[PDB]
Amino acid sequence: SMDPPTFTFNFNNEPWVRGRHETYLCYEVERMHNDTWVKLNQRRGFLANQAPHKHGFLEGRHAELCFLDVIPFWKLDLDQDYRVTCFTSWSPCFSCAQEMAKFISKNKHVSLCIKTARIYDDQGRAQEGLRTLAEAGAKISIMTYSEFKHCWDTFVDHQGAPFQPWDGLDEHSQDLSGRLRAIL
Ligand SMILES: *c1cc(O)c(O)cc1N(C)N=O
Ligand SMILES: [Zn+2]
Ligand SMILES: [Zn+2]
């Protein structure tokens, strides 16, 4: 679980704020059991991108790559159907999106849903990767109030405090979902 200030700073969907250099990724798994999706709450977690190593030269490992690194250790049953949801503060850069597309193509027991607080630019070339991820079968969408509240409730050390939406949450979300539709 996550510090409240850490959630609030990072999942803020106002487009004019800066300094959100990190990407946070919260994940949940459901298994299909006879027409309903059943939550596997023992599999839930979150992670962030890694800082580059002190030696320089190589970039820090991206959260999306870390996430893919971890799935094999869940030891999912290849004969079963699973729905994996990521709640991401930024959407993936191009190279991560392509890696993700490749992953889901090779693992057809996994349905991927990425719900993103904000769209990451990746100097224009990120739009292409989001189209590639959608083509390989991933559902990509913008976090609304429902997703933000769920993530607060589920992944934050809230100590019983309810999710408090920031001013503009809904409008920013709606602006972003129009952008994403254009993109896809
Ligand atoms: C993914 C994740 C999620 O929570 C819902 O409700 C639906 C999806 N979909 C539709 N994936 O294809
Ligand atoms: Zn190193
Ligand atoms: Zn990346």
Swiss-Prot record:
Region described as Interaction with DNA: 18-20, 118-125
Effect of substituting residue 22 to K: Modifies the spectrum of action against mobile genetic elements
Mutation effect (residue 175 to A): Reduced catalytic efficiency of cytidine deaminase activity
Entry protein name: DNA dC->dU-editing enzyme APOBEC-3G
Tissues with expression: Expressed in spleen, testes, ovary and peripheral blood leukocytes and CD4+ lymphocytes. Also expressed in non-permissive peripheral blood mononuclear cells, and several tumor cell lines; no expression detected in permissive lymphoid and non-lymphoid cell lines. Exists only in the LMM form in peripheral blood-derived resting CD4 T-cells and monocytes, both of which are refractory to HIV-1 infection. LMM is converted to a HMM complex when resting CD4 T-cells are activated or when monocytes are induced to differentiate into macrophages.
Consequence of substituting residue 93 to A: Decreases cytidine deaminase activity
Organism per entry: Homo sapiens
Effect the entry attributes to changing residue 96 to A/S: Decreases cytidine deaminase activity
Domain CMP/dCMP-type deaminase: 19-133
Impact after mutating residue 90 to A: Abolishes enzyme activity
Result when mutating residue 125 to E: Reduces enzyme activity
Additional remarks: Accumulation of APOBEC3G induced non-lethal hypermutation could contribute to the genetic variation of primate lentiviral populations. It is one of seven related genes or pseudogenes found in a cluster, thought to result from gene duplication, on chromosome 22.
Impact noted for substituting residue 181 to A: Strongly reduced cytidine deaminase activity
Phenotype when changing residue 120 to A: Abolishes enzyme activity
Quaternary structure (record): Homodimer. Homooligomer. Can bind RNA to form ribonucleoprotein complexes of high-molecular-mass (HMM) or low-molecular-mass (LMM). HMM is inactive and heterogeneous in protein composition because of binding nonselectively to cellular RNAs, which in turn are associated with variety of cellular proteins. The LMM form which is enzymatically active has few or no RNAs associated. Its ability to form homooligomer is distinct from its ability to assemble into HMM. Interacts with APOBEC3B, APOBEC3F, MOV10, AGO2, EIF4E, EIF4ENIF1, DCP2 and DDX6 in an RNA-dependent manner. (Microbial infection) Interacts with HIV-1 Vif; promoting its ubiquitination by a cullin-5-RING E3 ubiquitin-protein ligase complex (ECS complex) hijacked by the HIV-1 Vif.
